[PDB]
Design an enzyme around this catalytic site. Sequence first.
Site, PDB file in Angstrom:
ATOM      1  N   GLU A 124       0.878  -1.179   0.000  1.00  0.00           N
ATOM      2  CA  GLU A 124       0.000   0.000   0.000  1.00  0.00           C
ATOM      3  C   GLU A 124       0.912   1.224   0.000  1.00  0.00           C
ATOM      4  O   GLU A 124       1.369   1.676   1.055  1.00  0.00           O
ATOM      5  CB  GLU A 124      -0.942  -0.005   1.191  1.00  0.00           C
ATOM      6  CG  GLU A 124      -1.864  -1.233   1.285  1.00  0.00           C
ATOM      7  CD  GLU A 124      -3.250  -0.985   0.692  1.00  0.00           C
ATOM      8  OE1 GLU A 124      -3.589   0.200   0.466  1.00  0.00           O
ATOM      9  OE2 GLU A 124      -3.994  -1.974   0.445  1.00  0.00           O
ATOM     10  N   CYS A 147      -2.213   9.401   2.155  1.00  0.00           N
ATOM     11  CA  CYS A 147      -1.944   8.857   0.827  1.00  0.00           C
ATOM     12  C   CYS A 147      -3.128   9.067  -0.115  1.00  0.00           C
ATOM     13  O   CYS A 147      -2.949   9.026  -1.343  1.00  0.00           O
ATOM     14  CB  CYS A 147      -1.583   7.367   0.914  1.00  0.00           C
ATOM     15  SG  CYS A 147      -0.052   7.006   1.816  1.00  0.00           S
TER      16      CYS A 147
END
Lengths: 509, 508, 508, 508
Positions: free
Chosen positions: B266, B300
């Site tokens: 991720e 993010c």
Amino acid sequence: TLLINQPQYAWLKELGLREENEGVYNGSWGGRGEVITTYCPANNEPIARVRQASVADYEETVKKAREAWKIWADIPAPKRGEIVRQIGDALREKIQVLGSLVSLEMGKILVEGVGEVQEYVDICDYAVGLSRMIGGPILPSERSGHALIEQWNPVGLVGIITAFNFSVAVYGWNNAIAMICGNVCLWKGAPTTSLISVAVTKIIAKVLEDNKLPGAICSLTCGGADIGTAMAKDERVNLLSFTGSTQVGKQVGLMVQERFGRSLLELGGNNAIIAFEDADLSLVVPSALFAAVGTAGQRCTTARRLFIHESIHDEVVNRLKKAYAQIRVGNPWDPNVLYGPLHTKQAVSMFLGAVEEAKKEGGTVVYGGKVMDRPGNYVEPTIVTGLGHDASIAHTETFAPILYVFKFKNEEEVFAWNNEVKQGLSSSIFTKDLGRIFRWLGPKGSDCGIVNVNIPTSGAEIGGAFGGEKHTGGGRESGSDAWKQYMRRSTCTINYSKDLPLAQGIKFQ
Amino acid sequence: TLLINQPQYAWLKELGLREENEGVYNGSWGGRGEVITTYCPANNEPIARVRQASVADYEETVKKAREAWKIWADIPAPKRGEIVRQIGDALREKIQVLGSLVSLEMGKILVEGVGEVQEYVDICDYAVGLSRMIGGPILPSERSGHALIEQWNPVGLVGIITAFNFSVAVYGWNNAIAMICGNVCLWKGAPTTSLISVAVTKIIAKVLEDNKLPGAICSLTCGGADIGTAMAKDERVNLLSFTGSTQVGKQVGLMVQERFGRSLLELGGNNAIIAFEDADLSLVVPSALFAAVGTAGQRCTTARRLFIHESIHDEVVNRLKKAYAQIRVGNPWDPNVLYGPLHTKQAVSMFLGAVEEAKKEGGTVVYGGKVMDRPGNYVEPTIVTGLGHDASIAHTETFAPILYVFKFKNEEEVFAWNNEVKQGLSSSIFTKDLGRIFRWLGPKGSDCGIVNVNIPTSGAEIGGAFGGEKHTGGGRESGSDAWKQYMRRSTCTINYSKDLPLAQGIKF
Amino acid sequence: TLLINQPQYAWLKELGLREENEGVYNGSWGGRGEVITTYCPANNEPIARVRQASVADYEETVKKAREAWKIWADIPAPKRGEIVRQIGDALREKIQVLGSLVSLEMGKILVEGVGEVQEYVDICDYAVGLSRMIGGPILPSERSGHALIEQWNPVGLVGIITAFNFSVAVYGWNNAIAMICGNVCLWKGAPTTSLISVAVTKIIAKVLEDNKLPGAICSLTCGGADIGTAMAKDERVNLLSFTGSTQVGKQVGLMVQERFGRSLLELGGNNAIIAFEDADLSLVVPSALFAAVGTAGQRCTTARRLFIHESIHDEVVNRLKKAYAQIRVGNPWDPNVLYGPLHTKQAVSMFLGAVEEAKKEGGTVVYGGKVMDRPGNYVEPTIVTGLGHDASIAHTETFAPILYVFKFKNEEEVFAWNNEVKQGLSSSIFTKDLGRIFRWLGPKGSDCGIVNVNIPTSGAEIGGAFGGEKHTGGGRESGSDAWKQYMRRSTCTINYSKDLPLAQGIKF
Amino acid sequence: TLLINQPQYAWLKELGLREENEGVYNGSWGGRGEVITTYCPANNEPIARVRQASVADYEETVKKAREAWKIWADIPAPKRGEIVRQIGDALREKIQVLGSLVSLEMGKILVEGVGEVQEYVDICDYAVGLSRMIGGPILPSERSGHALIEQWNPVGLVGIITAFNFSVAVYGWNNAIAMICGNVCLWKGAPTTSLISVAVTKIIAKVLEDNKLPGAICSLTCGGADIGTAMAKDERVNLLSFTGSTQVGKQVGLMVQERFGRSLLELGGNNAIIAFEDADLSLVVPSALFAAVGTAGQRCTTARRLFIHESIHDEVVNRLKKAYAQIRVGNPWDPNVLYGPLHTKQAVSMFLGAVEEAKKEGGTVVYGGKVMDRPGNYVEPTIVTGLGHDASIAHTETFAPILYVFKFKNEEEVFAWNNEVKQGLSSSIFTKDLGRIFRWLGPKGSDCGIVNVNIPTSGAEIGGAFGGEKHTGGGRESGSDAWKQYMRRSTCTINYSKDLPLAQGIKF
Ligand SMILES: N[C@@H](CCCC(=O)O)C(=O)O
């Protein structure tokens, strides 16, 4: 001199093979690389020639494949399924001559070669219905006036690299699933099975062309390791399905990971059969024989380790030896033949060193162990007793018909011993004990992708996913939800309201 | 001098935090590694100290965890789910004070600190039901007298490396799902959020020990890159879930693949919001503001690229300015504060560096661009206009609140511009047009793992799977069947019949 | 003279019970029907009173639940799950006292009464996660520019009729599932367990009120056959879940069918245990004892037929007999008590009448048969040998602890004998033969909805769907995708393309 | 004088049809019942003759299908799928002639006759992959040493009763799915399409014979109501799938429910198209016409109500009149005809009565309304305006091409008006509004089984489940998980250990 020029192999022309064949298809046929001659492993005779891909041929094919995906991705999945239905029909029509070619160029017996085409046919018939099923759930959003949807979309270009031993079936699983999922495909097969690759590609090419679809949807670039390396390194190849050695696959895995690609890895197996004291020996002995010697021991799922309880070791080994002595050896396409040649002469050399290395690690050859003195790449099916389960040669994958036999006493140690190797493809126990079967299936049981009970390590069908754990590489092919590997998931939230409520109840004003 | 020693911060003790805290947990608490002190980014003051993992601590912790797994794997999944249910309740009881710690040590505002803890609470409640559910189909075999079953079993040890920006929620998703799936866990967090790791671990450790379960089921080894690298190379770590930068994710992916391990990646985002001429501009502006400046631009999933159709561009930029100027700035634990500090002083410097590089490449700072004149790591939330969508500073993810604004004209070019960057995490369009929406969700639409319509790029719920494509690394967490990544599939054929295969000419 | 007025039963007030209780709830508490008294079957002493629903009470309650549905159906399902989570917690905190009420008014032993409350707790935990999951697939359309999605939506009002023997668990499976599915519920329980119904409803009402939701979401109308008949005929009851006798459920099933409603029928059982020659007898005998005498044999899943292979028929019967003579009988709330009373005085006449009829049909009573000389509805658990497997007494369902034992030789005949009855609820075989087990699970095996191996016919878990075939009515409750019975499916095709239909020669 | 004796119809013999045909198939062909002549609705000429089933024929056929079931259910599902695949091939090969017979005997246009056979071909290809997929989950038991498995097995004999209008597609949906699921089938078609049944059955029988399977796996008993009633009351028919009128279907459901059988009901529809003000009128006008006049208005999915927003009502109606004037009427085999005859002269008289009733109830016939002056059952397609939305004739389902047009203003009322009828089959809105669309699909939207957007009420695809709600009867056919209606679920617990832990932790 070429077999395809002899009147007894005129049937090869039923596949459209000629003297020298184009090894590159991308809507057009071509090939500016080196011309390769494939040989019949049963008698070392040359069959026909294939023009391999140059680097310019590879490059142009990738570009045309990507150009074609733009059209293909816009075809509704069930209509893509209809194309795969027609591929299945085309394969069906030529199942006997195509399986005949598999026996000729690759060397497995005819029943297995027609059976390999049937897998491709079967996974086509399976993909037809699956093309009306692929998708994700619509989920209940926690947010009022919002929809939450899981979408699946094709990844783009699926490169498929196949080995010699399932020159048709492995491509089939990959191609039928990739295509209903909206991908284009690029195929680089083993060079010693080039004619097989071309003959299959010709079948599919006619179906695409009959439907006025761009042929590059199912492209072919015959070649060796440089075309394979290029595919692993190529950012335009969105998913690379590699079947082959653990050694080469590890590098394929690293090159794909370096460029944040996707890989589907089907690597080596070191598959164990375990026979417990309550095992039905009428099932154990023939299961072990087929699993060991089938395809001359050259399946990824071949039984290569045989663990037998102390009380029945000798009896199983003796009965196994009695049965080996009746295996009928001959040309793989003749009736009543059960056992043919190895695929290459190098495979014979690897067989010989394996056997010698097993002698040097203290093993005893109780059956076989020698090269057969006859035309072709023929070796004897071999049984080795007396090695410790942790012997180096027993932990090595050797693509040759050598069965290392071990004693054991209790379930816990032999489960561990099944699990102790690097590979993790297939596994099988023979027992009647209910508790032991579910333990084998449980978290302290077998660590493999295929976990069989009272059937050999080559027991698999297309309905379930096919692949392994650990050094087998993790990928899955064929059935269950293995199609998800060929598509990208999106979690999609749609606010159809006039408001903007935030997840987890966050007030932001 | 340490915040934990001043009476106004006495509430840290409600989480069991002391002046010097042990950073290793594996059933017992320890930490023979380097001592670090973490700092409050709102005032650059030290909070408290964490004794990190040495190599020997790491070695002992993995060993203890793999031993704990033998016990934990034998516990029926629903009963494992009952443990996860109590973890849920135990975060529920601490949600306000744990969220305050997140605001204090990481620096995000209080509603986002509690909301992050609420995500872990949410995924726990989800995993409890999932614990009665995980598994595979019984399939119809083509063979008489044979059963065909797809079994799922735990992979074993799940190592979890997390970043500073979501110091609780990411570990929460991985932990709740891995736990019910029968795995043990080993956590290494960002060193700058070590107090958060310790406090979370304290909550889990108590639930584990209250249930007379070995605490290594949820082990913690605080440390930096050496610990993370050790996990990436350790064959005893069967699955490595790594949330972090793209550069380090790529190296972790390669190390795990080198050993034929499993990785769940991720990585970074460079997420875009696209606003079509038909968009409800009253959804556009607050969505953009929140997605841009929320968490001071440190998610993010932060929106960093804003594409506005040529016809509404100036109005949207002008409306966004007016909205940026009304943001309330302050200490992040104070309620009704909307804008906190960046996580470090380095990030303040990297913020100025990107504003300068933006100007160099020809962009105009239409709002902000400067450090704020107050204690802590505060910068102004910034809007840059006039860059080409291909400018280099706009293709480099910078955890700083800089929103790059581009014009476009037509659907096709802006879909491609959304897709042109290396990352592939989140994306969103703002439009009323029914066909454009479905095309955005289709194979010629967005290439991201999160594909949104009329909401910002941030703020996903837990029911769906979370993660990105391309350089974001392809892993998924939380919802849907993301649990399958924490388990190994087996396809199992059982011959329950007395039938022998054909003798095929052999007398048996 | 009421037990609720005695000091020792003061724990009843912890549940909000009083001497006379309102038996109607729709947001308000009321009740204008006949006031009923419920009796403790352990001593035939009156416990307390409940005011039942009049016709007017029923009409007002249905209208209020149908209005509440307008609100409840708009609440996102995961937020409906948060309500159900809180119900689960409210039941957790009351599990001891509510279980004691079950023991006092219904008459099963305390561990089963607590364990019955546990089932509701369990299904709540499950339903919480299910509220994040329910839905159908988005399918690939064969049409360009088209979406194909399967939607699920609530049916509206779920009538729930329950019986006396599981006065909490059955309502709970239905309630937690119907709720997360977006439905409102109307409960009519067995009259003789009215206090249990009132007490469960008070627990749920508080949660609803605490969450500022219309209480009618979980309405109660205590009543007899007139209320149940009203519900079966009421077009406003979109789904009627009926758990009860086969004779009544059949009429319920027709009444619901006559008005094109949906029904969920959980009717009688006549469950068989089959022990083969290779069975672990140390499993067989305790399993048979529990399944036959647990709940004084008043479960719908109770074992009433016991087939034993003739090689071990006498041994199993003798060991089972010596095991029967060791059951501890007494007040169901007293410790280590395993056998309490029958539920009604009328049940004792049916038991005495069945025993004589069994003797009449040639069976031999080898244990029990008599009424116990003590206060309460206590009868001896009975074992009857020698009947032909097709004796009429053994095919009738009688809620009495009578076990009919038969011999067999062959697997084929005994599988047929299991299947020959009208009911198809539960079934179990005891064997070690791998093939026989999978044949038992296959198309020539058991025809029942619950098919077990080496465990009793009673005591399912929530993960799977619960229900029977044949005259058991076909309904499923609790696990798997049972939730779909509480929702309506729609198959939805969305044209989002600007493409027009083929003109086919017509000029538009 | 019979059409099959005339040279121009000799193509009929390619289907195995003769002057007098046997209407019973159970492995052998027969028919001791009455002989019926079916007639061509284009010209009322006799086609051929069929010997219907006597009750003795029905009796003998059920016994044979039940015996054939013992063999069929032992064949693995994927092998059953291989049979269905060959059936799709045998249909695929005969599509033109079978399509032409559908047009000749039933009376729809050749492209729709051919398209109806394609649906059967399509569901065959779909069921083949489904044959490797059907089954349930393996669930994690809460009990150690225990397995939890959901199993699906066939129900047995699936009786399939169809009506005239989709004399091939409906049978095929039920047949392909019931077959892969391990059931045997007995088909009773509408008497007026007896040749279609015989022709389809001849095609299937040849596949069964070539695969050396008992032909009674796909039995046929042509007959009228007495045969259908026999099936509804016959305990040996485990599932009765009934497509037909609500009136008869209601009685079918009651008869099946009385015997605790399983019924699948697919009854009438009174389907609505709603055109909102923002609708693409270029989509609306053709979609309406083809949905209303397609198959001479004889689909169960036929559009019978057209709601138009006030602002656009007059335009749409005027464009729909000018469009109805161009419908090319002729014989259903004539190339380039869009509209054939009604199936019977009684359908003509129902049509006339409906028109006159609509006129006597205040409506205006703005187009059509009259019987055509040519041979056959030809009536003008009709459009009726000025009628209140709840006019009695509008809520009557009259199987003829009448389209009742209503005005509306607001979204809520017109959704309510869609939902106000007793039928609940298909429904459609035309709009571009995103919020409106999801509301239509949500809990306050269309109450129908089929909920479409910007496409007409007919023409769904086999991927999804097909069927309706309310008085349409609730059954689902074809896609999604509809296969579960043809199978019985069993929840199966297996203790492979030497222990016996009780569910919910109940210590006995
Ligand atoms: N639930 C949060 C998680 C962000 C995670 C991250 O930014 O790395 C979101 O959807 O923005």
